[PDB]
Every structure is written in structure tokens, then in C-alpha cells.
């Protein structure tokens, strides 16, 4: 067992072995940016393939060009934490290398005229930190992936719903990454149509004329031909029999043999069987049979040149005779079979007004741009721009693969522009679907939806920046003299920087991070959204896209999703899910070879898995892979059934590959209703971290990975031995094997103390290790918020009883003991920030001072002489934190106030009080102050003091490492001059810096005795560089906005104890509000005197079917009951053998579980450390669909001498009597949610009104009123309460004279009103008169 895991081992109840480990849970964000910023010698990725798609930019006339050669990214100015303190973006500069080549066309192409090479600066790129976030303007942000529809071709139909006849109508769409849309469709009368960008509709074959096709070739590539001979004036026809399937003869079919089928008899399969087995060649038929068929070719008279029949004309014996009277011995006709070979394109050709290429182009032009007649070049260019130019159209590298695979071609790669074969193949397959071959595809399959991530949505915006730069580089290459021009003078960098920073800062997918928990961030970085640019809209998404689809299995979690109007649109990735190179989700499976499950893993996509038979994870194995039985439950083709043990191709890797990470932390999920597991998974992400952290007694084994992979702890990089521990830093001394041969080998970890998070909670680390103990690579060295020894701890485990108590737990209410509020188990620290900004005015600058006019000198005690509060003060609402005065314009005085000034002689002064104060209700301790002043402004006493002390302990943190480098170096030279003798103790009595002038050895030793003084100054080569750089970064000014002179920021800290009104919940969807804190001696107690912590209602369980909260309560008792035994043996002072035996009996208990703990390989101190860690209960592990069973729970309850039924007898605390029946008592795990009642309470008597309508403002942050909405007026006029309503409308909201007259009536003790006309009615009358309408009030 590992070092940090051998401290407290959690007992495992799971049965199935594990083949694949849980991957790194942040790979989706970290593998996607690394493709965008990396060097790729082959393109297709990121910056390289964005520079290879604009350049080279060639002159407008053809004279000169610009050529890209390479790029590189620089180093950032500040690191992440400096960026967060100062409030600036964390980015790196991009420096590209170009060359400018001028060349002439007088000489043929001569291009060695000149060459000018230079390196240009193109902007800043924000960088991703090592946890997957971006710092932008000082705040951490997350970019969320997007699930959207792939490019390519999609065949669909409306199912008998558009037309009244109940006929289905088919259509086909082509959709590019960038370009215009092209779609074909059918109509009731079976004519193909086409449209472009959902514009007005045109017949299909128009676009076949604009590709230079004639009616001959149009009918050639769509139809089949049958030939007729004239030989003896007798029409003969060469036939293959199968063409006559499903018909009925109107004539006699004669042949060499049998006279097969005649009047009334229709042709069955055995008839064409005769005709094929006898190989019937040309058959004579009546000449009335061919009359009505259409002709393929265009036939003209040879002598006179007059045409007899054109292509696609129906025949009659008139024209057949006319044809045979001219000498034509053959006729081609189009083979039609009215069930499979219908006439569609040939009857389509007969509604076109077009006859050749020019008329078709003119008609397309008339469609796209109505209102002007085109010319022979405008039409051709417009049609050549739509789908056939690489700079206005691009099917992405994935759109081409999807296009090729949806038409059964065999090539994967190709071009991004359309072709003639492509449009012809799309028409062909739409027609085949119309004739009952193949089927439509569905749009919610996870083979028709893909994921794009940060490193692709950033590249797609860098490219539009580059395009806007090229469109202005092209001009300067035309208009002027290219002799004295360098490439720096041609590239403006602001379009690119604007395009990048707008995406990273104001997009819809770039979001303010959720930072309550480790789990809150882990979940926010794995979310998948369907909204955003290029996705759906909330109001216009239907029912079918919000549902669960059979292809979600293993790729998307079916449980965790919001509950408002966003319910189906936002999803979460599963535990083992991955992504393809094209952006399609895939899942791992094990391969089954000859009835033997093998340990080899294959990732499969949603299209590939439908072809195989895949077994389940709940399947037993005969110790070599063989299935133990002969009917296995399996999935195939989207369904589930029983199968033999030889029809099986794959198997699942684990029982938890179907759930997300937030729902794999619920114990006994298999016993919960799904409507409640949804709520439990949602509410786990709102828990607040408490003062002390406490592991769960019943977990699922999934807490260690969520804690470590969130980057909220300090993990050791290299093994070693702890050399220094403090409350604020740790120093590790590395081993010799992991040691790098060139440096000192000392790791330093600096912990984070009392920092505020995005949600005003407290981030704080504290060390786990003690001084002098060994440490291996990957071990946890310090804990973050909500972590205990390296495991996620979101709440505290309470002692609960399920029973009613006097109506205090009536509807989801909770009743709490006073011992819970007096042990500080649910107390939380909140940190809040306030700011005071000093600006310029038209009358002169404001000043931050301590000479505040018209305030008593008691209220100025907590300020220092610079005008700012001290660190360590205790402030409450109303106190002054930063004193400030503003210059004031001269004021008028009322006559009465003038006489008052004349009598009492006092005069006012030129300045006004604008100080910063504590908001009401808040009471806190000041813990931090920061001052930012402008370059060119006098720094003040307090700013200089902050300067001094941060300089001081900024210097002190650097002199610590030179002692490892300098002093040891002396011990190196101590043994190289003494060579030739031993002068050790004589050498130990003189000072050390004098160790250069000792008894000198031979000249070899002497020249290296000067080499030592070379290295002894190499040390001062390296030191002062670093120190001066740090001092310069400390004492330098900053970049405050235009107009502001300085800024002061104060940080308060507040403690919040639990109280009636606070919301509380568990992991099973059970939630409720605290209703009462009641004394310790009113609580129900058991026969041993021990009272209970929390009392819950039993009426909540049956009608919600979250049974997992009962079983947990029974298991948490069995765990606690074991600790109480170990605890006793440590008070009773038993020897180590008794503890060894009892703990080994406790770890060996259960059915054939996969875990094996043998303590006989432990030392005695290790057993005692484990026992001291277990003396408050033994922790248990219960995976989601692999957990513990009631037999094992009861066996463990017996091991701790507890009742097997799980129910005990309780007494009433107020009367001492017994309750009639036994009660369920156990240990549950509860969580305090960030819905505190201090935030939510609000009230307003009067306040500020808005500008136009002059009604109260809204919100608690604005001290606003409450909306008396539209459907509350209905209730009030259903009661008949007319005066209540008239006062809600006039004098409380909106009447300007009445609302100030009412106040002075209320102060004088007269409850009466005088209502007038509201203000918004007058606003309405003005805005109607401004439309030209005369509206007025008649009297």
C-alpha cells in the first residue's frame, strides 16, 4: 500500500475485478489547446494550418508577394498569480517571420530582383494554465465544448404529414462548414426540385444544364435503354426476362417454344423463369404496344435534314411510320418499370422553361438576385462562385469523409469543393430512396453529431482575423513604390488581437468558473453544450433532441442535467468516454476470443458498435474468461436480448462506465428513483466547505481521484524526505536516484492561505506530512478546501432518527440539536472585497484623506494617518474603511437656513464626504489591504509600507538556497587543498571565508583553488540577476484606466453559524430547511443516555422511492459501531496483538470480495497509527452497481454487538416516557448548501427610482422593490379589494406627488391618500403622439 494510503485504509465491498484504470479526468481540455499552439510540420492543426491557408498574399496586379516562413511564441511578462493580483490577462506574444519578394513582368518572371526578410509581431495569445482554465482580466474562466451537427449530406423525409393524402415526401441536404446550402426535394406530383439557401424553388434539371449537359446525356446517366428493330416492318425487341417483372400482358408473347402468357394472365416468377431457362431472344410484338413510350435519342431525316422525333418525345404509330418511311432500322426507348423505375427525371424535364446553358444560368441569376437583367459574364461568374471556388466554399476535412461514406465510395480524403459527380450521386441516391432502396437517417444518432473544443473554436477565429488582415495587405502591394518598403510597414495587428480577445472574453461558451468545490470545477470543465454560435436556440428546440437515445450508452450520462427550460440541452461526459480524431465520441470494450474474454481494449464509435454483439458487465466468469452460463444478456442493433455464449464479440470494462463523475459518488444508486438521483447529483455541487473537514463513513471508492485530479492539493513531484514543514510552506529534500546531476535538489511548495474564490468562499491549504518522514512521487502533501488526507469531503456525518416530532419536521423540515451548533460543525468562512476609486473631476481631483469634515473623532480612531483602516480591525455596518473627500460646487441656501447660519454663525466648507463604508448587516474582520497608484502620482505612507515589507520578505525567500550551493562548495574545497596531509581540526578553528589562503598544495590544486573562486563568483553572477528582477517587478507602476488616480481594496472575513432558514441536503435527493434549534435535553435519547443529533420525517421516503437513504443509515451505524470497539481498546490500554486480531477480523468480512489486506506485514507503529486513525469509525466503499448486500450489512452489525434489525428503543426527553415502537437510528452524511438565509432576506421602505418611468428599481443589490405582477392584480380584483389596488398602483409605485405626500401624512399620524395619474401613462401618451396619432383625454 502507498505511503499516504497506508494511513487510513477504506474497506472494499466490491466484487468485480478492475481491468482498466480511470483516465486523467481533464484530458479533454488539455489535449485540445496543445494542438492549437504546437509546431506541426504537416499542417492541418492550429496556427500552422492557419498561416498556410492565407499566405502567400500576391499583388493585385501580379507584381510582388509576401511569404510566410515560420512562427514562434514568446515568454509571458507576468506569471499566473501576478496576473490575478494585478488584474490583467495571462498571455504570450506571437512573432511571425515573413519575406517580401518584388518581381517584374518586363522580364518573363524574374523574381531575384530583391528579397527583404523581417520578423513582425502579430498579437497576444491567452495561455491555458495547468488545470484547464484561462485567467482573463484577473478572473478564471472555462471554455465549454459544443455538440453540433456534422457537415455532409443528410437524407430525410416528412412522414405523411405535409400533404392531405398522407404521402411521405423525401428531401436531401448538403451542409458545408462554410459556404451556401443546397437541397433537393420531392413534391406531390413526383417532380424533383432544387433550392439554394432556402430560397424560391426551381426544377432540378436546371442545375444539370448549367453543368453543360444536354437532354441526351441527361437521359443517358439516369435511365436504361431497350432497342426496337424494324426488320420486316415487324417490331422486334431484344429482351432479358427480369425486366418484365410485375406486369400484365396486353398481347401474346410467342417464342421458339411455349406460348407463355396471354390475355388476362399476369406474369408470375415461373413465367420469366421459362423465358430465362430457354434464353428467349428477340420477340415480335404488336405495333400498338410501343405506341406511348418515350424515345431516347434525337432522330433526323438524312435527306431533308428535318427532324422526325426529338429526345424525350412520346411515340405514336404515326411517327413510327414516319420514321420507318425514312430508313431508320433501330429505335432506343427508356426502360420504365412503374414500381421501381418510375419516370421521375424524365417527367421533370418537361416542366422546365430552359433549353440550354445560357437560359439556365440566366434563370439561376434571376433567382439569386432579382431586379436586374444579367449579362453573359455576370451569370457565369455568380454560378462559378457558389460551390466551385475554394475561397467561398469549404467542406471540412470531416465533411468530405462523411460525404464519401454516405455514398458508399471508397476514398476518405478529397477536396473541399463540390464536383459534378457529387451532385449527380446525390440525385441518384435520393431517387433510389424514392424507389424503396435504402432508408432515411436520423439526426439524433451520435454518429451524426460531433464535439468541437477550445483549440478548434480558437483557430476558426484566428483565421477570420488573418483574412481581415490579408484584405488590406493586398492594397498596399498595389498602390505605391515597393523599393523602400519593409514588411513591418504593411501588417496592422489590431484586427487579429480584437478577433481573439472578443472570443475569449465575450463569447457565450466562455464562462465564469464555478468554484464552490473541487467537484464543482471538475464538473464545469467536462460539460457539453448544444447552445452557442452554430447551435440550437432554447425556444426553438423540440422534444426529440432533449430525450435519451440508445447511443448515449457509455458516451453521455443519462442522469445529470438541469431542470428548468435547459433540461435536455446541457449534458455531462461519462467516466471513460473519449473523443475521435474527427470529434466523435467513443467507448472502451474488451474483446471476446473463442468464448474467452481477453484483456485487450478497443475504443468504438456509435456507428461501429451496432454491428457487434456486446455482453454486459454483470456477467460471471469461469476463472479463465469463460462465461459461467449459456444464455447471456447482450445488446445488438439498438436492442437487448438473450444470446448464446458463442455469438458474443465484446464486453464492457466496468459497471460504472455509464454514469458521469458526479453520479458515481452516490452510494446505493441502484436503489434510487431516477428523478431523485438527478436532484442528488445536482445538489452535490453546491456544498460549502466547513471549518474542519470530515471524510464520509460510507463512500463509493471514487473520492481519491476527484480530489487529486482537481489540482486543489499539493502533490509531490519527486520522492524524498520532508526537510521542513510550516503552516505556510513545505521543503522536500530529493532522493539520489531522482536527483538531477546539475542542481541542488530541493523542492519548495508554497501554500495558499485564506484566499477568496469566485463565490466568496475561502480557499486555504494546510499540511498533512510531519517533519522527517519519507515521501514518494505522487503523494499528497497538503489538503485543499473540502479534502481530508487526500479524499473529497463535502460534509459531516450526523446521527439521525426517523420519526415525527410535534410537527417540527412537517413538510421536509429538519430539527437540529444545540450540540450541533455549539461544536461548530457547519460553520463556514466567507471573504468579501470592497473598493474605493479616486478620480478626476471638472473641479479638480478627489483625495483620499483622514481629515473628513463633520464626523466625530471617535469614528476616526480605526484609521491610520494615511486615511485607511488598520489590519486586524473589527468593523460593523456603517463604519468608515477609507476616507475620501470631493471638491464641491457652491450651493444655494434657503432663506430659513440662511437665517439659521446668521444666528448660530456656522459656515460650511468646500469639500464633500464620499468615503467607503461597511454595508449594513455585515460585520467582519479586515484581513488585507491593497493600493494601486498611477505612474506620476505621489506614493503614500501606507503604499510605501506595503512596498517595504513585501520587498523585505521578498528578499528573504531567496537567500535560503545559496547556502545549499555556497557552503557545501566550501566543503568541496576543504578536501582538495588538504590533499597531501590532514589539517582538519587546525582548519576548523579559523573563519571559513579565509579558506582560500591556507597551506597551498601543488599547482594542480592551486589552479583549481582559483577555479573555486571562479565558481564562488558564479554564485553572485546568478543571484543579483534574480533579486533585481524581482525588486523591479515589485516597485513598478501600473496601467489604471484614463481618469483614475488610485484605487484601494479591502478584504473582510465573516463567520456564519447555522440557524433556522438554512438549507440542508443529502446525497439522495432529500432536501429541506432547518426549522428549530432545540435544547440538548429535549431530544430523544436511547437507554444509555446518548441523545440524537437530527430528526427526520419518515413520511418522505415511501412516495419518493429513494430507498438508498435507509440502507446508508443502516450501514453507517455498522461502521461507527466498529470504531467504538477500537476506541475502547485504546482507552483500556490493550496490547498490540488484540488490536491486530480485531482489525484483521474486520477487514476479512464478507463474500468473495476482491480486496485483500494482510496486517501480518505491518510494523507495530504502523498498526498503532492505523488504529488511531480508525478510532472514530471504519470507512466503507460501495461502488454504484456493485455494492454491498443486506446479508453483509447484518453480518457487520453483528460484529459490533448491535441490533440486526437496525432499530432501537428511544425515550422522550421532555417527559421521560418510552415511544411505543422501535425507531431507525443511524449515521447519515449531510451537506450545507450555499443558499444561506442571510443572503435572501430583504426589505425596503423607500429608496431610489428609475430614470424614464420613475418606478422603484429592482433587486437586492439595488435596494429595490418587489414586482406586483400581472396575475396578482387578478387575485386582488377577484377579492373586490379596490382601495388596496388603487394604492398599489398610484402612491406606492409611480405617482410622484402622492408618494411624497403620503410619507408626510404617515409621519403626522393620518392614514389617508390623495391619488393622481401615474407617470407611465403620460409616457405612453407621448410615445403614441410621436407616431403621428392624436390621442387625448376628453372631459
Amino acid at each position: 500500500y502507498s505511503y499516504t494510503e497506508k494511513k487510513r485504509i477504506r474497506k472494499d465491498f466490491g466484487k468485480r475485478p478492475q481491468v482498466l484504470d480511470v483516465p486523467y479526468l481533464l484530458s479533454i481540455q488539455l489535449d485540445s489547446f496543445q494542438k492549437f499552439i504546437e509546431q506541426d510540420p504537416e499542417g492541418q492543426y492550429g496556427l500552422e494550418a492557419a498561416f498556410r491557408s492565407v499566405f502567400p498574399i500576391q499583388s493585385y496586379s501580379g507584381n510582388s508577394e509576401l511569404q510566410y516562413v515560420s512562427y514562434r511564441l514568446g515568454e509571458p511578462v507576468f506569471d499566473v498569480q501576478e496576473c490575478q493580483i494585478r488584474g490583467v490577462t495571462y498571455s504570450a506574444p506571437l512573432r511571425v517571420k515573413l519575406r517580401l519578394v518584388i518581381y517584374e513582368r518586363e522580364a518573363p518572371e524574374g523574381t531575384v530582383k530583391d528579397i527583404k526578410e523581417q520578423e513582425v509581431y502579430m498579437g497576444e495569445i491567452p495561455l491555458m494554465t495547468d488545470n484547464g482554465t484561462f485567467v482573463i482580466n484577473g478572473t478564471e474562466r472555462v471554455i465549454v465544448s459544443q455538440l453540433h451537427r456534422s457537415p455532409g449530406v443528410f437524407f430525410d423525409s416528412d412522414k405523411g404529414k405535409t400533404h392531405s393524402s398522407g404521402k411521405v415526401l423525401y428531401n436531401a441536404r448538403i451542409i458545408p462548414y462554410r459556404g451556401s446550402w443546397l437541397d433537393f426535394e420531392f413534391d406531390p406530383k413526383d417532380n424533383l426540385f432544387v433550392r439554394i439557401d432556402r430560397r424560391r424553388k426551381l426544377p432540378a434539371t436546371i442545375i444539370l444544364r448549367a453543368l453543360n449537359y444536354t437532354t441526351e446525356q441527361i437521359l443517358d446517366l439516369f435511365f436504361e435503354k431497350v432497342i426496337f428493330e424494324i426488320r420486316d416492318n415487324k417490331l422486334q425487341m431484344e429482351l432479358v426476362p427480369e425486366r418484365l417483372r410485375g406486369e400484365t400482358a396486353s398481347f401474346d408473347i410467342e417464342a421458339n417454344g411455349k406460348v407463355y402468357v396471354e390475355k388476362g394472365r399476369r406474369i408470375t416468377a415461373r413465367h420469366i423463369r421459362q423465358l430465362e431457362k430457354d434464353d428467349v431472344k428477340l420477340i415480335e410484338v404488336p405495333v400498338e404496344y410501343i405506341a406511348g413510350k418515350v424515345v431516347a435519342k434525337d432522330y433526323i431525316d438524312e435527306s431533308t435534314g428535318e427532324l422526325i422525333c426529338a429526345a424525350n418525345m412520346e411515340l405514336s404509330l404515326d411517327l413510327l411510320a414516319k420514321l420507318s418511311q425514312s430508313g431508320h432500322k433501330r429505335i432506343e426507348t427508356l426502360f420504365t418499370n412503374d414500381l421501381d423505375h418510375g419516370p421521375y427525371i424524365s417527367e421533370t424535364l418537361r416542366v422546365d422553361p430552359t433549353n440550354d446553358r445560357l437560359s439556365a444560368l440566366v434563370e439561376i441569376y434571376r433567382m439569386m438576385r432579382p431586379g436586374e437583367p444579367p449579362t453573359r459574364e455576370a451569370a457565369e461568374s455568380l454560378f462559378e462562385n457558389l460551390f466551385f471556388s475554394e475561397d467561398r466554399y469549404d467542406l471540412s476535412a470531416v465533411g468530405r469523409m462523411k460525404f464519401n461514406r454516405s455514398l458508399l465510395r471508397e476514398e476518405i480524403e478529397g477536396s473541399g469543393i463540390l464536383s459534378k459527380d457529387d451532385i449527380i450521386d446525390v440525385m441518384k441516391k435520393l431517387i433510389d430512396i424514392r424507389n424503396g432502396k435504402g432508408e432515411v437517417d436520423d439526426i439524433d444518432h451520435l454518429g451524426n453529431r460531433r464535439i468541437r473544443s477550445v483549440g478548434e473554436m480558437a483557430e476558426n477565429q484566428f483565421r477570420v482575423g488573418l483574412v481581415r488582415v490579408e484584405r488590406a495587405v493586398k492594397e498596399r502591394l498595389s498602390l505605391g513604390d515597393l523599393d523602400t518598403l519593409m514588411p513591418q510597414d504593411m501588417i496592422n495587428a489590431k484586427p487579429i488581437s480584437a478577433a481573439v480577445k472578443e472570443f475569449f472574453g465575450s463569447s457565450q461558451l466562455s464562462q465564469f468558473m464555478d468554484q464552490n468545490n473541487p467537484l464543482s470545477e471538475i464538473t464545469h470543465k467536462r460539460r457539453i453544450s448544444a447552445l452557442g454560435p452554430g447551435g440550437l436556440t432554447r425556444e426553438r428546440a423540440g422534444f426529440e433532441v432533449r430525450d435519451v437515445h440508445p447511443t448515449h450508452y457509455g458516451r453521455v450520462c443519462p442522469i445529470e442535467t438541469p431542470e428548468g427550460p435547459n433540461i435536455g440541452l446541457i449534458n455531462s461526459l461519462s467516466v471513460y468516454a473519449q473523443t475521435n480524431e474527427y470529434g466523435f465520441l467513443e467507448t472502451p470494450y474488451r474483446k471476446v476470443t473463442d468464448g474467452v474474454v481477453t484483456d485487450e481494449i478497443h475504443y468504438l464509435s456509435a456507428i461501429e458498435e451496432g454491428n457487434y454483439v456486446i455482453a454486459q458487465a454483470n456477467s460471471n466468469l469461469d476463472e479463465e474468461g469463460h462465461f459461467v452460463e449459456d444464455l447471456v444478456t447482450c445488446r445488438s442493433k439498438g436492442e437487448s436480448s438473450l444470446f448464446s455464449r458463442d455469438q458474443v464479440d465484446y464486453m464492457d470494462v466496468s459497471t460504472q462506465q455509464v454514469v458521469s463523475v458526479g453520479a458515481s459518488l452516490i452510494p446505493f444508486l441502484e436503489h434510487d428513483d431516477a428523478n431523485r438521483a438527478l436532484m442528488g447529483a445536482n445538489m452535490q455541487r453546491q456544498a460549502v466547505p466547513t471549518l474542519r473537514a470530515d471524510k464520509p463513513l460510507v463512500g463509493t471508492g471514487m473520492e481519491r481521484a476527484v480530489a487529486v485530479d482537481s489540482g486543489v492539493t499539493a502533490v509531490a513531484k519527486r520522492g524524498g524526505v520532508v526537510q521542513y514543514v510550516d503552516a505556510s510552506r513545505i521543503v522536500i529534500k530529493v532522493n539520489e536516484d531522482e536527483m538531477y546531476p546539475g542542481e541542488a535538489g530541493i523542492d519548495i511548495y508554497n501554500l495558499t492561505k485564506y484566499t477568496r474564490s469566485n463565490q466568496n468562499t475561502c480557499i486555504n491549504q494546510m499540511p498533512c506530512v510531519s517533519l522527517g518522514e519519507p515521501v514518494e512521487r505522487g503523494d499528497v502533501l497538503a489538503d485543499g478546501p473540502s479534502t481530508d488526507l487526500g479524499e473529497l469531503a463535502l460534509g459531516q456525518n450526523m446521527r439521525v432518527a426517523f420519526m415525527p416530532w410535534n410537527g417540527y419536521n412537517f413538510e421536509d423540515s429538519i430539527l437540529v440539536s444545540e450540540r450541533v451548533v455549539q461544536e461548530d460543525r457547519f460553520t463556514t468562512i466567507h471573504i468579501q472585497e470592497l473598493a474605493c476609486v479616486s478620480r478626476d473631476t471638472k473641479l479638480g481631483p478627489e483625495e483620499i484623506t483622514a481629515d473628513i469634515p463633520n464626523v466625530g473623532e471617535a469614528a476616526l480612531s480605526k484609521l491610520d494617518e494615511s486615511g485607511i483602516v488598520y489590519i486586524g480591525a473589527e468593523v460593523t455596518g456603517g463604519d468608515i474603511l477609507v476616507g475620501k473627500v470631493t471638491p464641491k460646487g457652491e450651493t444655494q441656501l434657503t432663506p430659513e437656513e440662511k437665517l439659521l447660519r446668521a444666528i448660530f454663525g456656522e459656515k460650511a466648507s468646500d469639500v464633500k464626504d464620499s468615503s467607503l463604508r461597511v454595508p449594513n448587516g455585515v460585520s467582519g474582520t479586515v484581513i488585507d489591504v491593497q493600493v494601486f497608484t498611477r505612474d506620476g502620482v505621489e506614493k503614500d505612507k501606507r503604499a510605501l509600507e506595503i512596498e517595504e515589507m513585501q520587498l523585505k520578505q521578498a528578499k528573504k525567500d531567496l537567500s535560503e538556497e545559496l547556502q545549499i550551493l555556497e557552503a557545501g562548495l566550501f566543503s568541496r574545497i576543504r578536501a582538495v587543498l588538504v590533499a597531501g596531509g590532514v589539517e582538519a581540526e587546525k582548519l576548523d578553528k579559523l573563519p571559513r571565508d579565509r579558506w582560500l589562503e591556507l597551506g597551498l598544495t601543488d599547482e594542480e590544486k592551486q589552479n583549481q583553488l582559483e577555479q573555486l573562486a571562479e565558481q564562488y563568483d558564479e554564485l553572485k553572477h546568478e543571484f543579483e540577476k534574480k533579486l533585481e528582477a524581482k525588486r523591479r517587478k515589485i516597485t513598478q507602476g501600473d496601467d489604471l484606466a484614463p481618469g483614475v488616480l488610485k484605487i484601494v481594496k479591502v478584504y473582510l472575513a465573516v463567520k456564519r453559524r447555522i440557524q433556522p432558514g438554512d438549507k440542508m441536503a443529502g446525497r439522495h435527493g432529500n432536501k429541506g430547511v432547518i426549522s428549530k434549534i432545540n435544547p440538548i435535553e429535549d431530544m430523544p435519547y436511547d437507554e444509555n443516555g446518548t441523545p440524537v443529533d437530527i430528526v427526520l420525517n419518515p413520511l418522505g421516503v415511501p412516495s419518493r422511492m429513494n430507498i438508498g437513504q435507509i440502507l446508508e443509515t443502516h450501514l453507517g451505524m455498522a461502521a461507527k459501531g466498529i470504531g467504538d470497539k477500537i476506541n475502547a481498546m485504546l482507552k483500556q490500554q490493550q496490547e498490540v496483538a488484540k488490536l491486530r486480531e480485531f482489525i484483521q477480523r474486520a477487514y476479512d468480512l464478507g463474500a468473495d470480495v476482491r480486496q485483500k489486506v494482510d496486517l501480518s506485514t505491518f510494523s507495530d507503529e504502523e498498526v498503532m497509527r492505523l488504529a488511531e486513525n480508525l478510532r472514530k469509525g471504519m470507512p466503507i466503499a460501495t461502488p454504484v452497481f456493485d455494492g454491498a448486500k443486506e446479508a453483509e450489512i447484518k453480518e457487520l452489525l453483528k460484529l459490533g454487538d448491535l441490533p440486526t434489525s437496525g432499530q432501537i428503543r428511544l425515550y422522550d426527553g421532555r417527559t421521560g416516557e418510552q415511544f411505543e415502537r422501535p425507531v431507525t437510528v443511524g449515521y447519515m452524511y449531510m451537506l450545507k448548501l450555499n443558499h444561506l438565509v442571510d443572503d435572501k432576506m430583504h426589505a425596503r421602505s423607500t429608496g431610489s427610482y428609475s430614470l424614464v418611468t420613475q418606478q422603484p428599481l429592482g433587486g437586492k443589490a439595488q435596494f429595490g422593490g418587489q414586482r406586483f405582477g400581472e396575475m396578482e392584480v387578478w387575485a386582488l380584483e377577484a377579492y373586490g379589494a379596490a382601495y388596496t389596488l388603487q394604492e398599489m398602483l398610484t402612491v406606492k409605485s409611480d405617482d410622484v406627488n402622492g408618494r411624497t405626500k403620503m410619507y408626510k401624512n404617515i409621519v403626522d399620524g393620518n392614514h389617508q391618500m390623495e391619488p393622481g395619474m401615474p407617470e407611465s401613462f403620460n409616457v405612453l401618451l407621448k410615445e403614441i403622439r410621436s407616431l403621428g396619432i392624436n390621442i387625448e383625454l376628453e372631459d
Binding site: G807, F810, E811, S813, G878, P1060, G1061, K1063, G1072, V1073, S1075, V1237, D1238, K1240, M1241, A1243, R1244, S1245, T1246, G1247, Q1255, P1256, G1258, G1265, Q1266, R1267, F1268, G1269, E1270, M1271, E1272, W1274, A1275, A1278, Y1279, G1280, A1281, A1282, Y1283, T1284, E1287, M1288, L1289, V1291, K1292, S1293, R1299, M1302, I1306, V1307, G1309, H1311, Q1312, S1320, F1321, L1324, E1327, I1328, S1330, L1331
Partner: protein, 251 residues
Amino acid sequence: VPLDGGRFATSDLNDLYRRVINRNNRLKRLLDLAAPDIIVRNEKRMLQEAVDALLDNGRRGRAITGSNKRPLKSLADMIKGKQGRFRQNLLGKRVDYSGRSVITVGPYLRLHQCGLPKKMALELFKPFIYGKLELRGLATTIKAAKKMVEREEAVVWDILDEVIREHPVLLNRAPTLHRLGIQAFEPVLIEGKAIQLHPLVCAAYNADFDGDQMAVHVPLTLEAQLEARALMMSTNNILSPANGEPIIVPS
């Protein structure tokens, strides 16, 4: 209007009026230079389009957009719709003398009683307390009464107890589906911050204690107090108005 920082903010009707003014001035210039008619016609077309976009923006063509690529709002979009004057400012408003908070259960109350926190009641009842303070001579002027209330002296809590005596209070929970969604109670001052509701009225409200919140309103005049006592008090509302059945059944 200026914001904090020197930046300004403006309406869209300014953007739409400037275009009209300086396309009308140009036409008054061209009619004096005696230009060709092909140019005066183009001016008259542009003037027509500008006035149309000032009155109703997206009606006769493409919608004119602003420098952030959003269509400008017009004189007709300020009257009509879910966010026009009619439905947003005239048929429902924001009001003074009101608050809200989380609710919890008190099982010891009578049917005509609710529990109200002390701090909410001190804020909602301020002018009543000022007048009562300066009637007893405990304060000389209204501005000293303000500081007495702000310091929370001991006599303030004794004036508050006789101000709320026989003063009803309207409670309301959204969505208000029928008229039993607003009812009048008599308040009982408590410590703490959550409101306490009688267990028998949670069925007309459709309320429960998994986190719901409620709003509080104060009637000011004599007639509103009479109507809150006679018409809306919870002890007159035992029957349903849809069918004649009782509504207070135990759950």
C-alpha cells in the same frame, strides 16, 4: 446619461433621429444646386427609408443595425409586446413597502397569525415609528428619530410592538394561480430571519418547506386595512370558490 467612469449611455431613438435630420438637410442642399434628377430621386428614396425605420424598423425591408450588429429599437417596439409599455409598466409595477424571505413552519400558531422577523418589520414600518417616536416626545425632530432607530435603542423595540398591534400584513407566493394566493395575517414578532407560516394554509398556497420563498406587503391607509381585515383574512377563506368544498383539510 453619464456613467461612473466618464462613459456615456444613450437611447436608440437618437441614432434614428440623426439619420432623418441629416438626410433631410442634404436634400435641401441638392434642391439648391439644381442637380440632375437621377440624384434627387436617390435622395428621396433614402429619406423615405429613414423615416420608415424610425417608425417601424423591420417592416419594409432589412432592419437597420447598430455598431454592435443588433437591430435598433423603434417607436413601435416600445409599445407592443411582452416587454412594451402596456404589459411591463401599466398592468404590473414595482412597489414600495415590501420585502421577501424564506419560509419555515411554526406549529404553535393560530389560524390568523404569522411570524415576522424583527429586522424586516423595523425596515418596513419606518415612517410609522418616526411619527410615534416624536409624538411621545422621545425625540425632538425627525432627524434625531432617524439616529435613534439606526442605533437600535431599547425604546425602539417597545414602539415597534405597539405599532404592529392590529396591523395586518399581506403574504403572497408566486405563481398566483387563484385568489387564495394572497392572504392577510396578523404578525407576531420573532427573532431569526425566516418567516413562519401556519401548517394549515400550505395547501391553498401550494407551498412547502424545501426552500420556497414568500413576499410581504404592507397596507397603508384605513380603507386598505378594513379590506384586509374583512375580505382577505385567512379565517374567511375556508371554502373553495371553484367548488364549494373546504380547503383547510389536514394533510
